[model samples]
Target chain A: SQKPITLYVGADYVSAFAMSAFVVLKEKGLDFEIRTVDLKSKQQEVSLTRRVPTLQHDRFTLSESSAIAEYLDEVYPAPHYAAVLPADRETRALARQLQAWIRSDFMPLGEAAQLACEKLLSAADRLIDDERYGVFGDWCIADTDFALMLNRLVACGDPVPPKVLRYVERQWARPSVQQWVKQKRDA
Target chain B: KPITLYVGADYVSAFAMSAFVVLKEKGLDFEIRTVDLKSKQQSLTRRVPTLQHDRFTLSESSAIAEYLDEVYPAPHYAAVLPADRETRALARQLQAWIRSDFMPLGEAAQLACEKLLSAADRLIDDERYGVFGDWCIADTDFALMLNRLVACGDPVPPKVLRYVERQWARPSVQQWVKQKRDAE
Candidate 1:
């Protein structure tokens, strides 16, 4: 039997990127183990400096959740699995653009722990469009990330649009996301 | 048929130097138009090392490098990313991480470059990848970051220092260093 991949994640579900990595593993249908790293205690400091969702496969170890997600997609592209990225060059670029944009741009508001609730609600209102497609038509990794971001607003009782909330619900309903939610709940 | 790159005037901007090194490595003809960060008319968001090809303008350094690799790929100008998908993904991740993270290293290097901070004391001693095995844009990124410390008399290890020197000695990097010196 192949060795199970090990993912070291932080104990915070507020870390959407960590959950994104978990979603990738589930979507790829890979055997993996999730180990919790305590952010409050700095246990992961020796191995990682600033990021969470580090992946270990055999002797290789990598950090940065997007990198982990891509590594999972590239290394374990099962015949029956749904790809986390679209299979075309341009579409893949679009997916990557959105992915990178989300990582760079949205964190100030989406992950802000102390922002005023009304301001965060307004921020979400300006950022998300209910009518637009999710980067590309079918569900992919970017959607998983956006779902997490949008769900944060909903969880905070921020007045996100009904359609956007519905979109988050649709993504949360996926088995991969459900797995992550259950794990977060159990933790 | 030359591309235009808006860059910083001196060896100050490691970010600009990264894009410059890639163009040199790919053997693509490009002209550098130095931009003064203080007095530049461009918005704060549109910083230098912006690439202007025929019609398209790209801001971020890594994206510019990737677009160039895809559009002008040849045996002579090999991809900065590895051919294998897994390595390529890893390289991409490294590039992404450097782009977003490492603010401390970047700021400290900047201070070192300006002779305001002692690089010898401020060096990040982690040998995470040891300058990496094969040269890619990631190497260029790391080498330039380390060069600031080295230039400012940092106490980087002999092995790590050697890697930075090797990267500096590359024809591409050499050309950029010379051009920057001559322009100064």
Candidate 2:
């Protein structure tokens, strides 16, 4: 229970990235402050191009989780804490790659799936049989978070590949992520 | 389930194509469900280039390409560019620049290449790629993006230019160029 830093985040707090940040911050036992952004009209106030989980601390205002993680790691050195990114350069690269894939590779289908749930389900089921998951391991922050996000969307009755259930299960067991999910649920 | 590039084939969506090429080059088993902007099955975001990975699906091209590279683990190239935090940041800076600032600048470059080879050459000679020799992930990617623009009738420096030539000289680049040319 220490206040390593004061974080300015969002209210009504639901975001994989924001929640992930909170999870890490809480797990790190870092002190932070959440700002209840007028989520509906935040763009008018902060000039943030998009949505919530924007952290404004002192002179630093960052939106994206990738930048926020780096800023925190730099401002406070916590080698003992769970590293969100992989340790090795190659691994980190791979980790970054995972983030991109989640954003780019699966995103469009995800959006389409969101709008046309039935079509999405059919396609996702077939994709699994196609061996589309490729490889899985604990390396990047994207892996578990992606699994969790997909699970959340699916839990909302959205369509997703069945393998995602297993992926989310494994991700939920990871100490850091599990703690994050629990916190969100408790919140 | 279908790994689709929701885009026009002869279009130059630089950021969008990054994911497309990454998955393709890495030998990731995927199929393109090509959809143009005019397609009746318009994208969820009305965007080009969406991939349907096995279980997961997403939108933003930047995030997609990063995911593919991570999950697929392309053994072909340097895992991440720069190989250091500062360098990685720098690479991101370039990437973000192109994604954001340099997009219009790049469009201008594309047009320049279309109209005058010399104009395209000038943009290619920007200080951005000044640090060229050994291939960095960012370099290879950016170079490939430029090549994509060229292939799509966007303007770009001629392959004869020094940096462009050197980039194309890479075995990977050569293979990609050839593959694109041969794509049905």
Candidate 3:
């Protein structure tokens, strides 16, 4: 457990990107202190790169939530950190591609809740049997991100498939994500 | 080395040129083959700048850069990404942002490169100007984007223009400029 790494997060509870970073930290078993930054008033204080979640670990200050999550996974690696990325070469590259895709794109789905729900339903339709558990039949960062994608639509009152909602619930039920939500509520 | 880079001809496709600059930066000897965007056969998705190394073929410029860096990392060549873990992550973030973000700037730049005077001009703000203290693939991407504006005589800050000139002067970028000019 590293001494409380500082994370600059959005002041509001609805920042799904920041929540992803928080979930990753909890999953890695690392202690982090969240400093809430209001984008309206305190925009200049943080780096100008689409501000939401910026991590400051001692002297190193890193922006971009996707990179911060990946950094945490690599720096505070497995056994203790619980590898969010796969071990196999091709799988790991694919995981990175998925992570990067979710990170950079998907604004259309984010803005349009109905469309997000529709996409989730379509994705659900393609899954078979035990494959419905996660994207790769195992929990990875992509699953957490896909869960958050579903949560965004659900929170916005859009209808999602029962199977997809169940998968989101299963991902959220993890102690790490649970703790993250609790801490957010308590903070 | 049977490395073949499928690039888009003409001055179009800065993304393709960005990949070309990266391959040059790695000091790798490779053949540059032009891909016909009209045919849509060179790339499965019709994206130019696909890299073919022997039997393996890859899409996406940033992914190709990572693959090349991993496979051909030499201390003398010096990888584009920093050795520090956090810095490397930040580089990845910057590269991803350049790829996805700045659509308006990208469009404006593309039009400017095509010699269209009526294209919307996206000014380089002070914050973005200072963002490139060190050179990386992001800087190369930014340089390519900004060069279009300057080339078309669009108003840009003197400092930003100088930065673009500096990047353009790099041997790899210079070679790219020559190749593009020769093709035209």
Candidate 3 stretches with Cα past 4 Å from truth are A39-41, A48-50, A110-129, A150-169, A184-187, B1-11, B29-58, B103-134, B145-157, B178-184
What are the iRMS values of all candidates? 5.8, 8.4, 5.7
DockQ of each: 0.24, 0.08, 0.26
Query: Rounded to one decimal, what is candidate 2's iRMSD?
Result: 8.4
lDDT of 3 by residue, B13-90 (tens): 777777788888888888988766565442322356778887777666776777777767758675866666766787
lDDT of each: 0.65, 0.49, 0.66
**Segments in model 2 whose C-alpha atoms lie over 4 Å from true places:** A1-4, A27-29, A45-50, A73-80, A104-136, A152-163, A173-187, B1-11, B16-184
Error of 2 at B12 (Å): 0.7
lDDT of 2 by residue, A11-114 (tens): 55566666655655654556676655555645333313234555565544555555555445545554866565656544454445444434333343344555
Model 2 Cα lDDT, one tens digit per residue, B51-159: 6765455555554655555565535543534545444444443343334322233555554344233323433444545333334545555555454344445334444
TM-score of 2: 0.47
Q: iRMS for model 3?
A: 5.7
Once superposed on the true structure, which residue ranges of model 1 sit more than 4 Å away at CA?
A1-3, A44-50, A78-80, A104-132, A146-173, B1-13, B30-59, B72-76, B84-86, B106-130, B147-155, B177-184
lDDT of 3 at A181: 79
What local lDDT score does residue B45 receive in model 3, on the 0 to 100 scale? Answer: 27
How far residue A106's Cα lies from its native spot in candidate 2, in Å, is 5.0
DockQ-based class of model 2? incorrect
Ranking by DockQ: 3, 1, 2
